[model samples]
Target: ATFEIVNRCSYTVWAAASKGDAALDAGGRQLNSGESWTINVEPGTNGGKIWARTDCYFDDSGSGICKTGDCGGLLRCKRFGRPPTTLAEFSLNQYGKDYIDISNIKGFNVPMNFSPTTRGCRGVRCAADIVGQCPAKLKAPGGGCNDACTVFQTSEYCCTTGKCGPTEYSRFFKRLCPDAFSYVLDKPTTVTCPGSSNYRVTFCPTA
Candidate 1:
């Protein structure tokens, strides 16, 4: 139980992780501004995912490319890393508890804070301003912000003609990160703790 990846932004950040499918810290690095990175979850570990790769360009051994999350570009991540990427989900130790969440459904490049520094639970944030309050049709070319079911995949933003609701670009990202997970059947968005909790995931966060 140890996970901290702080980085008060203002530039440079290339974090990445994957726990469940291997590849944790070794999967990415290069933090600047304030800089921080830590990982260690082994009390029946099984959590996963973490992101931040805006405007990257690794070379000379790390490969290159990263205007957003970018996994295949190889910074070490071998999977799950494309999209506006602003996720920070986890789920260590299941049954007893320890589940955190924060997602943008593959949209919103950065700006997060999935806290729980020692068992206070109830932590979840996304710091709005979704890339200048996007809405230029889910803009995301050299930046982030694109989740109308990844840009209108059908059924009123990809509900696929079954039970679509919350359009208007996921209610404009649930009025800008209302506990995140803004689409794909958004709900309360998990956040339980106390299995001896220990976590932190700040990135341009101020809480």
Candidate 2:
């Protein structure tokens, strides 16, 4: 299937994706405002994640660090981005369905939307102004909202114990992003679509 990454923000966003060990069509690339890239994956591809990095600086050789969602301080990444960034996660062609979700469980750096390109599929989005409204304790230096677990590192916020649920902190994210994952045990985080469908992931659609 094909996954299209669309950038609707005003500035440049470095999009990154991590699949198995296979080389990605657009694993890491600079996408200017209003630009998009389409990456094609095989039918069996699963457990992949896509995200965007902000406030990045790179040299002539494409080596640099990002203020948010930095992955090993490199332009291309084969690993997941750092916390406090939005995530578009997918398990495609697994058990004959495509499981997808937009997750804030790692906290949120940008607004995001994930939708199927085929009929009979649902769309999930979280476009709230999180950075502006972020609580002082969970605010990152450059931008983005840190997860309560990351900020507090307590069992109550981290849900490390058995049968944990959302706290006031997770509720803060849930209030803004009802459709996306707000905690590790978020119930409404996943949706399924036919495996044959294509998908589109958009960043900063409200900007």
Candidate 3:
């Protein structure tokens, strides 16, 4: 399978990807408003996630930090970045099927769309003004909304013991992103598609 990461935002952002210990796209990439980056996947890869970082800067040797989702404050990310960012998580060829989903497990920064380019598989989108409408307690200091779990590590919000349910904060997120993950244990997040499907993940997307 392959993946396309598109930046539809009006400002510059960095794209990041990681699966286990493997960092894709040399860890990070700069995307202008209209730019898109395509990545070929390692067959049958699992635990992969793609996200965007905003308000970042890097020196010549690729050293810097991002206002949001900064992976070790490096231009080349080595692992999953810090949260308050949108995600396109996937498991390539898992059980001979492709699973793609948008997740707000880490919170939300940009509007996002995760869609398969082939096989007519259904798409998942979380394109809304979540940042602006973010509640005070769950708001990030930077420019994004925080997940209840991220802000509060209690079992009620983090689901640490599997004894958890949605809260008012998560409900707010669910209303905006019913198709994706709103809280720690929300159901109906993954989309299973036939194998050999290519996917696209767009930031600041409309459709």
Candidate 4:
């Protein structure tokens, strides 16, 4: 199985993924508009995530910064991206199911769509233009919408106790990208497929 990273946005994007050593193309590279990078992986891959970084500046040594979704100020990611980033999460061959979702619980930077190439698999997407209409309180520094948890960081927003529910602020995001994870308790957003499915992740699909 594999994940095809596609960029449909008008501007450049730094697509990123994080995974273990088992996967060679776990990611950290840029894509111009309409470009793509295909990452090969096996069926048992677990805990891998994909996202995009914008406004990045990297040197020849692969060290630099990204305005959105920067991972330790490094071009290559060995870990998760920072908050206010759109994420495509996956855990293939987990108990014979492929778990997938476009998560905005940490808020959204770019619109994303994740779909399976195989039949019988449901596709999930969060293609809303969130940044253009982000509420002032949850607006990020450069671009993107910050989750309420990032701003408030309270028990209510962060759901540290695992007993939290959606609030008005969280509802704001849910109202826009209903298919995405909008809060800590947003479990209904996930979709599953057969373990053998391949996926294509597209950024700014409408663009």
The numbered model that scores best in TM-score is 3
lDDT of each: 0.80, 0.86, 0.86, 0.86
For each candidate, what TM-score against the reference?
Answer: 0.35, 0.94, 0.96, 0.95
C-alpha positional error of residue 18 in candidate 1 after TM-score superposition, expressed in Å = 7.8
lDDT-best of 1 and 2 = 2
> Where does model 1 exceed 4 Å of error?
1-15, 18-23, 29-41, 44-57, 70-83, 86-88, 91-95, 100-102, 105-134, 143-180, 183-187, 191-207
Best by lDDT: 3
Judged by lDDT relative to the true structure, which candidate is superior, 1 or 3? Answer: 3
Instruction: Give the 10-residue window scoring lowest on summed lDDT in candidate 2.
Output: 18-27
Candidate 1 lDDT over 21-91, as tens digits, reads 67865767878877888877566566588888877888879989888888888787856688888888887
What lDDT is reached at residue 18 by model 2? 82
In candidate 2, what are the lDDT values of residues 1-207, reduced to their tens digit?
A: 898999999988999888636335657888899999898866767888889999899888878999988888877877788888999988888878888999888889989999998886898899999888888888998789999988888877777864678787788888988888888877866988998789998999888
Write the number of the candidate with greater TM-score, choosing between 3 and 4. Answer: 3
Candidate 3 on 1-207: residue-level lDDT in tens?
888989999998899888748787566799999899898877787878889999998999888879898998787677887889898888888777988899887899999999999875798999988998899998999889998888887788888887799898889889988898887679978999887789988999973
Worst 10 residues of 1 by lDDT: 153-162
RMSD of each: 14.1, 1.6, 1.3, 1.6
**lDDT (Cα, tens digit) per residue for candidate 4, span 35-102:** 98898866777877889999999999888989899988777787778878999988889988888888
Which has the better TM-score: candidate 2, or candidate 4? 4
- Candidate 2, superposed: residue stretches over 4 Å from native: 20-23
